[PDB]
A paper describes a structure:
By studying the EncFtn from R. rubrum we demonstrate that iron binding results in assembly of EncFtn decamers, which display a unique annular architecture. Biochemical assays show that EncFtn is active as a ferroxidase enzyme.
The crystal structure of a truncated hexahistidine-tagged variant of the EncFtn protein (EncFtnsH) shows that it forms a decameric structure with an annular ‘ring-doughnut’ topology, which is distinct from the four-helical bundles of the 24meric ferritins and dodecahedral DPS proteins. Despite a radically different quaternary structure to the classical ferritins, the four-helical bundle scaffold and FOC of EncFtnsH are strikingly similar to ferritin. This overlay highlights the fact that the ferroxidase center of EncFtn faces in the opposite direction relative to the classical ferritins and is essentially inside out regarding iron storage space (boxed region). Furthermore, the position of the calcium ion coordinated by Glu31 and Glu34 seen in the EncFtnsH structure suggests an entry site to channel metal ions into the FOC; we propose that this site binds hydrated iron ions in vivo and acts as a selectivity filter and gate for the FOC. The five metal-binding sites on the interior of the ring (Glu31/34-sites) may select for the Fe2+ ion and direct it towards their cognate FOCs.
Residue numbers in the entry:
A (entry chain H), B (entry chain G), C (entry chain F), E (entry chain D), G (entry chain B), H (entry chain A), ...: 7 to 97
D (entry chain E), F (entry chain C): 7 to 96
The structure:
Amino acid sequence: STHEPLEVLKEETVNRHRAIVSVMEELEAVDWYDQRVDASTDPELTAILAHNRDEEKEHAAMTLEWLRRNDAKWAEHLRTYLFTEGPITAA
Amino acid sequence: STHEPLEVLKEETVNRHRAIVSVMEELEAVDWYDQRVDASTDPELTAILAHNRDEEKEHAAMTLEWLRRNDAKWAEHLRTYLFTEGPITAA
Amino acid sequence: STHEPLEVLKEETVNRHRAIVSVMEELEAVDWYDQRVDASTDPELTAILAHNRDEEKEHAAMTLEWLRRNDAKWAEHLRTYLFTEGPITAA
Amino acid sequence: STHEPLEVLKEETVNRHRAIVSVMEELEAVDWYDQRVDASTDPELTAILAHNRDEEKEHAAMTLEWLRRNDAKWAEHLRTYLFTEGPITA
Amino acid sequence: STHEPLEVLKEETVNRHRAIVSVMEELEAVDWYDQRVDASTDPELTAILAHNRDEEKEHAAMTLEWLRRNDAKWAEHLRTYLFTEGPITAA
Amino acid sequence: STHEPLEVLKEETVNRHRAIVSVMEELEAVDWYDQRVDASTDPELTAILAHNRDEEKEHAAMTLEWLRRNDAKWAEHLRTYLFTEGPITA
Amino acid sequence: STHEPLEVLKEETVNRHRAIVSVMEELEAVDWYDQRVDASTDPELTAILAHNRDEEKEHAAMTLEWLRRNDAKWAEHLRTYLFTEGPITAA
Amino acid sequence: STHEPLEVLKEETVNRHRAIVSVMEELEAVDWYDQRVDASTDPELTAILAHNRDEEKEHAAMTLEWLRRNDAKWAEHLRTYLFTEGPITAA
Amino acid sequence: STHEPLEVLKEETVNRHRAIVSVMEELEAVDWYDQRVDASTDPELTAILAHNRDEEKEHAAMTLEWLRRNDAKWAEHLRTYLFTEGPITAA
Amino acid sequence: STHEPLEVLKEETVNRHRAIVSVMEELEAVDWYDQRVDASTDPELTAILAHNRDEEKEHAAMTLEWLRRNDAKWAEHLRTYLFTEGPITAA
Ligand SMILES: [Ca+2]
Ligand SMILES: [Ca+2]
Ligand SMILES: [Ca+2]
Ligand SMILES: [Ca+2]
Ligand SMILES: [Ca+2]
Ligand SMILES: [Ca+2]
Ligand SMILES: [Ca+2]
Ligand SMILES: [Ca+2]
Ligand SMILES: [Ca+2]
Ligand SMILES: [Ca+2]
Ligand SMILES: [Ca+2]
Ligand SMILES: [Fe+3]
Ligand SMILES: [Fe+3]
Ligand SMILES: [Fe+3]
Ligand SMILES: [Fe+3]
Ligand SMILES: [Fe+3]
Ligand SMILES: [Fe+3]
Ligand SMILES: [Fe+3]
Ligand SMILES: [Fe+3]
Ligand SMILES: [Fe+3]
Ligand SMILES: [Fe+3]
């Protein structure tokens, strides 16, 4: 699932790939579940969709913390913007 | 680009969809660029790919902070795991 | 996200569609996470990937149980095969 | 059809992959068929579509049972929720 | 799932479409299952795969007979070639 | 275009794959052409579309006979339903 | 199957779209069948594949003639290059 | 980009594949551009789109002539139908 | 082809969408033709592929110029980097 | 991610491939972000989307300048059309 041949990729690059596509898949699941929660017309299904939705956010956060500990630029930019106040574009 | 009809989705659900697919696309770009950075055999191109790569991480971080500010469970789970030490699964 | 126009689909068909597509996506996440667990060369990442993997199995089982309660034929066939011993093809 | 090279995957991982994608494909067929059953305006076709639909559930159930027998946490989590009463999120 | 808008398609064209895509999907399942049957290294799984495989052929055959009964050229061409002997291109 | 590596597939399996994918593509063309025939507002084009459509059916029927001759379960199930009368789900 | 909404498209444009996509699908079948013909290890199947292959070329040629009759620039460029000798880039 | 492994394909088959997929891509560009021409509400863009469209037809015709010179059935079938008069299905 | 409903998109956004997607498709064609030029083993075909390739670049440049003239930020950023000589990341 | 096998492609072809798909992805991001800016009903999100949008144009422009410096026909055709006056077609 990589775009370049594995023999020219550094191991750390490939591990970061694994982490990044995981976050991508978690975000997609968050998004789809939230849409299904709004549209669902069954209360028992809605409670299940909403529970799964919010656990995906936890999955994403864990993997994003791993990216942060293993990439100086993820560390730098996440530190600049996360948990701030005032206009996000002026930080 | 939504899986459910727009008329049954809450406004904040659609705006979070816009933000979430944006973060997904930034992540994809990070990964793609980093792979091309490893495989490139032209250092002038490599310099452009790496420059672009790291700005995508900033675009992702900005959008993630917006999500964090506009979604309680994103705020909760990001607070739990980001900028921690020790085992990520037990934070 | 349906193959037929929503206005000819019964309400229950559309809810089962939401549940079915959720189980599909969970199964896919299990499989992909398990492959990344095998291939990962970073122990902290591996711990995270395996943690998320097993929670997707729980998201799936919760949704399958909803399908079972809301579809007589799922109930019948799941009852026949799940939690049995001996040859599966002979139950 | 795997995302990681086969030489780094354990045999058991690959067999579970085969089962898992089988279940996915059965689920998809159940959903597709059910929608076509609702939309179809020919009763003879509808009968075929519905027949096929419910046999895919059986295909899915059989494959899922194998998965369950060959993966400890599938077995654990399915045991928690399947054939229960009261709120599923509990 | 139609290539043309439903509002210009005749009802019977749309029903034949439902049948054709059904057969297409069955054929795909037969093929994927057979490939998994050859590659599987667990005999209990292999037996299930083979079982499912052969029932997809029956799903296809039922739907093909519906097409034969509802389309005169399907009827003509299936009668010319199916269950014949000697060279297929010379029937 | 196979989901499993070629080195573990039997030769006959790969040939059936060639046949099956051919039939799938013929069916897709039949369907696509029939929709275009319905939507077309040019009679000369429609005539071409309809002609091509019905020849795809012949392409499919030929390849389907090859499968019937080379796969016992295709022979069995095709024989149960094809050229029959009364309700198909029986 | 169009990229723009049908009500902004001229009728004739939509009919040329039907013809063009038909030719595209015929070309694809020609290519795939030809590849299957080279790879097949069953002579009887190969004869069916080659027979079908060459009839796709006729389906394509027929539809292409309609295009030529209904589009002045198709007529111009097909006239310039088809059935010529010497270097194609110098026709 | 081939469906069969390159080692079982004849060189000529692969060159024909390169030409066929080129024509397919040209036809797709012709169609897409023609749709954007009808839909555009900017005349300067429209003139560019129309210009590109008609040059794609030329690219297709050139490549189609190469196929004709390198494939007996293309030569046969193109000769039968192109630049004819009266009903196309009857040449 | 758009990701948001057309009725919420400004007319100029939609026209820029048409141009942007045209450039993307032109770039794609340049890349694929260039790959086919390298791999082709028939010199007559290679000459056609190379000719078409280089015309796609002209199609892209024309459309890129339309974007330059109709979008302030494209104009600003293209002006900064196009037709320069020093190291690209420092302009 | 190439359509031809890497061992038949020149090094320069593959690096141009890396730049071109990068430009394509940048163009796609510009378009998607621009559509989201129009549709967004959250002004704080809109400002992030617009910021990111315009930085993608800069990423594209850098990469495009690299292509211009490494491909004689890109340089020739870009020089013909960019930053010109009068009708784009007649330049
Ligand atoms: Ca997913
Ligand atoms: Ca992208
Ligand atoms: Ca390992
Ligand atoms: Ca059975
Ligand atoms: Ca399927
Ligand atoms: Ca049965
Ligand atoms: Ca096709
Ligand atoms: Ca009509
Ligand atoms: Ca294209
Ligand atoms: Ca200068
Ligand atoms: Ca250079
Ligand atoms: Fe998850
Ligand atoms: Fe970005
Ligand atoms: Fe999940
Ligand atoms: Fe099935
Ligand atoms: Fe089936
Ligand atoms: Fe055909
Ligand atoms: Fe055909
Ligand atoms: Fe072209
Ligand atoms: Fe072009
Ligand atoms: Fe970018």
